[PDB]
Symmetry: D5
Subunit: 140 residues, 10 copies
Amino acid sequence: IPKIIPPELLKVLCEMGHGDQLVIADGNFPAESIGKNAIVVRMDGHGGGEILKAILTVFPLDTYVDKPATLMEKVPGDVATPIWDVYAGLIKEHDERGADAIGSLERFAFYEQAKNAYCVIASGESAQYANLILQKGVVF
Amino acid sequence: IPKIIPPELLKVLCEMGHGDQLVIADGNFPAESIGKNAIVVRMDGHGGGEILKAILTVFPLDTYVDKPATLMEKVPGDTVATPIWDVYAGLIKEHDERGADAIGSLERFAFYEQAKNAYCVIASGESAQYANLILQKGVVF
Amino acid sequence: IPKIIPPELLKVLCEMGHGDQLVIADGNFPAESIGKNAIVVRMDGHGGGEILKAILTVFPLDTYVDKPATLMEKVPGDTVATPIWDVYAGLIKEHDERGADAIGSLERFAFYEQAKNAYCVIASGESAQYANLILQKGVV
Amino acid sequence: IPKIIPPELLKVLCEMGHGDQLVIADGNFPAESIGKNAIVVRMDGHGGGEILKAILTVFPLDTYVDKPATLMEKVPGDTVATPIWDVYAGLIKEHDERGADAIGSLERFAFYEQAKNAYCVIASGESAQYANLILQKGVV
Amino acid sequence: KGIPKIIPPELLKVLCEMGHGDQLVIADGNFPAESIGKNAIVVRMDGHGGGEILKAILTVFPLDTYVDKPATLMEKVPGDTVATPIWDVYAGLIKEHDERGADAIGSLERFAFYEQAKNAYCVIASGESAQYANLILQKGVVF
Amino acid sequence: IPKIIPPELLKVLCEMGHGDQLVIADGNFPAESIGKNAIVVRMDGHGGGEILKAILTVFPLDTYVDKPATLMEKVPGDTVATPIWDVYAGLIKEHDERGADAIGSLERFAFYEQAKNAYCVIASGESAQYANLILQKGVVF
Amino acid sequence: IPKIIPPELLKVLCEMGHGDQLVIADGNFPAESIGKNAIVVRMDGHGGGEILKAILTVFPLDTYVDKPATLMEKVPGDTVATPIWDVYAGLIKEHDERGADAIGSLERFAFYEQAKNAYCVIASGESAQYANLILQKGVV
Amino acid sequence: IPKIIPPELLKVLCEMGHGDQLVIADGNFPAESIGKNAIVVRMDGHGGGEILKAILTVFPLDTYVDKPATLMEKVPGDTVATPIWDVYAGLIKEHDERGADAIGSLERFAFYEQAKNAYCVIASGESAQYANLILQKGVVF
Amino acid sequence: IPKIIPPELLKVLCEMGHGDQLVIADGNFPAESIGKNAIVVRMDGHGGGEILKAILTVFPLDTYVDKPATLMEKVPGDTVATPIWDVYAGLIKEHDERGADAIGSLERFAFYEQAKNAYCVIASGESAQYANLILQKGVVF
Amino acid sequence: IPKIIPPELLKVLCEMGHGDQLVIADGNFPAESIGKNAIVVRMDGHGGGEILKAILTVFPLDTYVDKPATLMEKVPGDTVATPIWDVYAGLIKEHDERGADAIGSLERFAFYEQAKNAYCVIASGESAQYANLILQKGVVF
Ligand code: NA
Ligand code: NA
Ligand code: NA
Ligand code: NA
Ligand code: NA
Ligand code: NA
Ligand code: NA
Ligand code: NA
Ligand code: NA
Ligand code: NA
Ligand code: NA
Ligand code: NA
Ligand code: NA
Ligand code: NA
Ligand code: NA
């Protein structure tokens, strides 16, 4: 069990089932309001990459959709996003799809999808557009 | 009364009335999120057959509908076998003469929508896929 | 004040006002699920007639509607006898001059729909089928 | 399973273990105050005998103590008849060969003290005075 | 309809579920009803006096005959000479239901009174403007 | 501050702002059900007049609407005297030159729907004919 | 950090993210009813200017919208002077180049509707009318 | 009613009775922990003098004790000026002829023990040290 | 991680620290009343052996005491076989060299008093003789 | 304000006053059970040094006692190295001239007893043993 996962989040990850979603929220993300109907777990001292790595050790990404990981598209007009490659690299560790497992949603569509999440993890990730929705797959 | 039923589930089964539904959720099912507005009872160490057997000893299946038991249909392109469906049919036949004919089905997403209306979701540890089962309560005459 | 009425139900009956409804649920009725947004009072050891008689001693039936008492109609093809309907009519006639004319009916699923709006559901142990009754409160 | 037992009390009876006590409270008993730290189940329309009969069908009396059933003694100088004590002894005899020898007693205020330790207090409508009974659960 | 109109539904519930020996406090306007009643049920009756509350309660609440003095007043602080005519009003209202009348009323020193009131099942917060108009009532038997 | 106002109601009256409504409900009104999403204050031993009188000492009536007080319209057949309406008009006149002109009305079922939106319902013991009253709070300048 | 901000409001301001709104409510605003589904923080002893100045030291205004601050428009016919609007624009100018141009407006009832969506309503004692202000949080 | 008092504190002051205590806590005081079993009202942007002035307009000080206001004594060895003590005396003198004589004191830990029994703790932002004040409520005759 | 452990028990096992205790209660044990101040996890369908086996995969037994597992002493004069004690000893031996030497005991009422202090009580359906077991958590080095 | 501090912990640190204590719990510490009556904030992915450094940026150590920081003494016979104690002393020295002299100690079980009185327990992931630290808050002048 990854050391950074608090007992409440371990419980959450275990009780999620096929198709449930969680959000890794970056430091700018309105995690408490979006997650008002969800379980919000604070991880303010941690970045998106280390959180994703920890989750992927125990959380299978859904194979029943082509893109079980979802990023937020940059607002038209709007910075470099190397964390997206970090995310792809981490997914590649566990899932052969790697970067092809990652889709995207326009900002407001992303918020709408995130309000449906079972759990929002409030990170301290300082990179912008570092939000990531993960959809749980099957344990076979 | 089957030894495996915890006091809370005994209370649930008793307070359910005619037409109420419960869900026997397999180990892959999103029991907590689907059951967010229902009573969720954990039974992680038990399989679907053992739970269904216990429930049927104390829970009459509805005769006011043709198919009081509902399975989740396999997603198109998913060819996994489902011998557990046959296990369930055998268990149902022991209590209800309709047997397999009392078992209907719903497309995956339709099944989720119906399960959200259940009074109670039982989170089993059943490892078989598509081992979810909705049960509708009948009358005590 | 009828001895069978528990303190909580006395409070309920007193705080209901003109137009509020209560359901006397028979033993087969889904009282807890239907009453999810209501006050559910358990009276599992009592029949419908006993409960109705007790209630009517303290609960005026609405004269601002035709039919302040409502039965559940038998489902198509169900041929079970319903002698309790005459018992209920007899009891209502002890308190309201309209007697059986104060009793209407709803199809089974429409009955459930109306019962979800009740202020209080009383879960009886009445063994007779179709022994449910919705009552609407009048003025004091 | 006796029809008069509501679902909450069935849960209570099942989750009680060896040595847990419940109180069958008569109509004059301060059930809510004594039971402030316990589960209080209302049974206002039922007598002590009816309730005891129902409980004993599902509740084994403790054989690890001499007197698993306990009555409240009459206040010195209160000469009121207590026929219900013989009714209780008869009911106990039906389920436990000890019969009346399984029944002890406590002075009024000592009875209140013991009752405050009960897991569950059942508030009956029993009109007879000194019709309270503490029952201690045995092994299954 | 035999029930006094001033009793709110919560208090009717309280009066019914009290049993033999349970106590309630009719708290005067100056009484610390919320703090004393921290572990009790507090019912607000701010617009009502002590006499009208007592009169209403006694229509539904039998006073305990297993003790000599089921009603208890607060004793005046030594040196406080304030008139207390409501004590005789309370006696008259009790006498209407219980032959003991004034003899059914005991008293407790101020701080002892607070200690006993903390044990009450319910504290009724009246608006009674008279001092020392607090009254503890102990419930009797319904035979 | 009038003595009849309990501490909770004082808090409510202070918390209310411009446009907020309260209901003075008569003895027959379904106060608890209508106010299920509001704050319900019990005043069972008190009449509509005495309650209104007390409230108006601390509650300004809205001048941004013509009729900040609302009565329930009589049942279509009913010719009964409504002396409490004149009582209410009189009490309003003490604080607001509009007096009776500040009182509007709503049909029974529309009145219930408006009452469901109130911040607070005061459950009085009023027995007078057609005594329910909605009040809308104004500005403190 | 400003002395006037209580610990609960500090937590609110930290947990808000990009796009979240708070309302600074004037003394006449229906802060509790509007904020029924929000966090309402009482600041009854403080004016609108004092509160805005404090908030802006820790709360970045959104640059992803042109007008992240919103005033309530005067009711047509209500000709009351609104000098606080200039006080607000001045305070905004200290942190944001846009100054007065960062302030939009909503008709009275539209304003109430939008305020119902706020994460937090701060209930000021501001005695001036039309002193309400909605603020939308930007990025860090 | 002084404008600085929030609705909840108005409710608190009204529901306190003869002998109940409240604490005006300075900015250094452990108001939340001391007040764990009480009602804690945040007034972080206000000083002790302004709070006391506001409270005294609606809160009578107990005449059944000699000293209804209580300060915290300086820890032996803590040489610090406490000009706010004279401020407090002045404000009390406005309402109670006893003035400075109505103010007693408790050693630090005795003070905390007494404060734990208060009905309400008001958490001020007062930066003056030893600016804590316990007030005991009197009678409304 | 053994499949029988429900999410809530996983959380419990993770949040326990050095010296914390859990009780594996048998089917006759008063788990809800003893555990009134603890977290009670229902495991009604499982035996003491399988729960212990599962727990020990994730839960180190304390080495700062000699006997981190505690059994309930038999009723005086009871000479009934206690085969589950050997089952327990074997399961402990798989993880801890002390094996049976890691197991102590308490008289029935002393055992209840200690169980009242446990962080978590697991309500099993174990019917074997003298099957209650208290476990004390060790260190992760 | 250090990035690692979550909103809830910021609120805790602000609302603590003079003499209130918090515990930085190491990964082996029974943070949830000891903190049953406190606020427990999870910081599982962070070590003791990192947390102490962040806390000391916003939390003044009490000068009204000689030793406002408290360590847990090693169990007699447990000779495990404790280099973190020097790390802690160095971090304290950055804010308080007392440095290591500001650190006292309590025997293990006495440490648990004292920690039960803390306002807040921070559950770190610190892997070193005896890395628990109790901090007592001072005044802001
Ligand atoms: Na999958
Ligand atoms: Na599934
Ligand atoms: Na049927
Ligand atoms: Na039915
Ligand atoms: Na009528
Ligand atoms: Na009795
Ligand atoms: Na036994
Ligand atoms: Na009596
Ligand atoms: Na106005
Ligand atoms: Na306004
Ligand atoms: Na921005
Ligand atoms: Na006085
Ligand atoms: Na160890
Ligand atoms: Na430790
Ligand atoms: Na200091």
